[PDB]
Amino acid sequence: MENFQKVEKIGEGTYGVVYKARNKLTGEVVALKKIRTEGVPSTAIREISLLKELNHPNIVKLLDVIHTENKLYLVFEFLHQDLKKFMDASALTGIPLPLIKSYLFQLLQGLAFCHSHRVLHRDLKPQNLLINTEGAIKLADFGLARAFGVPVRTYTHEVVTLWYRAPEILLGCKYYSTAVDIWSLGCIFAEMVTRRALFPGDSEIDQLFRIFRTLGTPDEVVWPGVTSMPDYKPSFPKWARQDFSKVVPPLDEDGRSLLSQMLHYDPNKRISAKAALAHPFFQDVTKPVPHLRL
């Protein structure tokens, strides 16, 4: 606290509040997350000290982890804007496709890296995707679900966004796979394209039903084992899959094809980050510069 010259609240993360702070000594400007205890799971602190080694250009760098006074502080490299704010600022014009494509490609590179090291994000959303003036986009605020036991409620009772949650999580699957991050990224990709959230649920059931209404209620044909999942109910309504050209107009067929593969119901059929990077949609990918007003 005395090591970081005052501050400036830049939001309230999923676990606590996030601040923009300056290293009272080095003068370094960083993002500081203050995690709000009764001892702090040594297991969690250990799994954290593992994210410190995760270095990659498309992953926000975790500089230090500091436990003190029952409070936990995570020091991260600071970026000036998040994708949620950038999308709202581009809502009237839309983000140009080359930039959408560049961001998607970089995020898949970041995910391919995390996933090859057996690390899952679990909570990807526009708010935790950070961008800079150089055209880079980075994954931040990695969630460590289960962590202490089973996270499902915050302290500030701040509403949890379900818009990007994979269907297997909603159906009660106990073990998440790398596929959950691909689903979330697919939802984000669609949102950059249409400038509207793909599946804006207000509850867990509304989230699930919004997905079903668009992609069709899943069955054993498209998703083997789905009817035996924990929260699956034979009473779910049966919606026909909607024509996909109506989902993300006016995205081209290469884009629509990749998105359809990122949104497959069966986590085992869902495309991997590595395979996605080889999709035809990225044959002409470039690295444009965004117009950022800081």
Ligand SMILES: Nc1nc(Nc2cccc(S(N)(=O)=O)c2)sc1C(=O)c1ccccc1
């Ligand atoms: N690294 C990092 N940078 C951030 N910047 C930022 C983000 C939004 C607005 C503004 S600003 N200046 O007010 O325009 C700045 S946030 C963050 C996180 O590491 C993080 C931590 C928890 C949850 C999500 C990201």
